[PDB]
Write an enzyme that holds these catalytic residues in place. Structure first.
Site, short mmCIF file in Angstrom:
data_model
loop_
_atom_site.label_atom_id
_atom_site.label_comp_id
_atom_site.label_asym_id
_atom_site.label_seq_id
_atom_site.Cartn_x
_atom_site.Cartn_y
_atom_site.Cartn_z
N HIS A 1 10.85 9.38 -87.30
CA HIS A 1 11.92 10.26 -87.47
C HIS A 1 11.95 11.06 -86.06
O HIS A 1 13.20 11.38 -85.65
CB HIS A 1 12.42 10.82 -88.15
N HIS B 1 8.71 19.62 -81.69
CA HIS B 1 9.04 18.07 -81.79
C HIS B 1 10.62 18.60 -81.54
O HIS B 1 11.27 20.07 -81.14
CB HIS B 1 9.53 17.47 -83.28
N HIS C 1 14.76 16.91 -81.34
CA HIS C 1 16.27 16.11 -82.13
C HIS C 1 16.62 15.98 -80.78
O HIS C 1 16.81 16.88 -79.86
CB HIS C 1 16.83 16.60 -82.84
N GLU D 1 21.14 20.53 -83.24
CA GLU D 1 21.09 20.19 -84.51
C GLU D 1 22.01 21.41 -84.81
O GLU D 1 23.53 21.35 -85.33
CB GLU D 1 20.08 21.02 -85.96
N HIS E 1 12.44 22.44 -81.42
CA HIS E 1 11.56 23.10 -82.52
C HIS E 1 9.75 23.07 -82.54
O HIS E 1 9.32 22.50 -82.70
CB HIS E 1 12.40 22.40 -84.00
N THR F 1 15.85 20.96 -91.18
CA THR F 1 16.67 20.15 -91.32
C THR F 1 15.94 18.56 -91.78
O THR F 1 17.05 17.98 -91.28
CB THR F 1 16.97 20.06 -89.77
#
Ligand SMILES: N[C@@H](Cc1ccccc1)C(=O)NCCOCCOCCNC(=O)c1ccc(S(N)(=O)=O)cc1
Ligand SMILES: [Hg+2]
Ligand SMILES: [Zn+2]
Length: 256
Positions: A61, A91, A93, A103, A116, A195
């Protein structure tokens, strides 16, 4: 299992993770006019001088950079926090396009990516026990916008070739995270969750006001990663972000 696809996507998480519709999710839209200036809020204290990076892993992911948290090496304190929080991993997103990826949003505005930095409250003894506490985790959220390249992020970008598929990891030592910080530590904070499933509500979120800029070719490499494992149909790792959730009476405080 859970993913970002149209069948296992966020609209479906609630079915396996009922907390998906809880009272303190994660991410949220930051309405700057309604955010409360709180003068009692202290300056964040980031001590990453002693950080010990170990490895980078594609977990299906996102890609995670893991840090040794066996001792108070890379910590976070101050801000709205009580006690010392240890960095365990960072990591990102990101999106398929530059106009999406973050996010958290600010006044409905979406950034191309979101960094994050995950920390856990040392008083609880391990990451595992920290996720059972309402003040268990502290995540430092950082927006990325497309502009000029970020020197500090290139070492990450170059190793991405090595962990293109799910389950692949590569040795990743002597990585200094100080290189991913904005110039200013002004922030917004609110009580939220993780999240991604299991979406546990033990996070104090600290969203930095000032976004870091990365180049187009930097973000491009993020997008060449795969959700799938080796020998499976290729599914590009894009849009691994969760839409904004209802604030529900929670208050967003500003350090500025
Ligand atoms: N022991 C079980 C329950 C149990 C008990 C007895 C018998 C069977 C099961 C249990 O509670 N396990 C809890 C596991 O909690 C770990 C949370 O998940 C780990 C991986 N997820 C993260 O670490 C994670 C970190 C940061 C973010 S983010 N995106 O908000 O920054 C998102 C996710
Ligand atoms: Hg919790
Ligand atoms: Zn995250």
């Amino acid at each position: 299992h859970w993913g970002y696809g149209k069948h296992n996507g966020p609209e479906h998480w609630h079915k396996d993770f009922p907390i998906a519709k809880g009272e303190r999710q994660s991410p949220v839209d930051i309405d700057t006019h309604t955010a409360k200036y709180d003068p009692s809020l202290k300056p964040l204290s980031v001590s990453y001088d002693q950080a010990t990076s170990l490895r980078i892993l594609n977990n299906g992911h996102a890609f995670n950079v893991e840090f040794d948290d066996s001792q108070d090496k890379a910590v976070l304190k101050g801000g709205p926090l009580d006690g010392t929080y240890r960095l365990i991993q960072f990591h990102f997103h990101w999106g398929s396009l530059d106009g999406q990826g973050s996010e958290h949003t600010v006044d409905k505005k979406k950034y191309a990516a979101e960094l994050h930095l995950v920390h856990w409250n040392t008083k609880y003894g391990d990451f595992g026990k920290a996720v059972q506490q309402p003040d268990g985790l502290a995540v430092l959220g950082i927006f990325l916008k497309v502009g000029s390249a970020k020197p500090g992020l290139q070492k990450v970008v170059d190793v991405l070739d090595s962990i293109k598929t799910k389950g692949k990891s590569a040795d990743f030592t002597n990585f200094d995270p100080r290189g991913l910080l904005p110039e200013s530590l002004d922030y917004w904070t609110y009580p939220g969750s993780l999240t991604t499933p299991p979406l546990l509500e033990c996070v104090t979120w600290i969203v930095l006001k000032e976004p870091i800029s990365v180049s187009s070719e930097q973000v491009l490499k993020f997008r060449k990663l795969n959700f799938n494992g080796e020998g499976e149909p290729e599914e590009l790792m894009v849009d691994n972000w969760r839409p904004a959730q209802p604030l529900k009476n929670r208050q967003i405080k500003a350090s500025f």
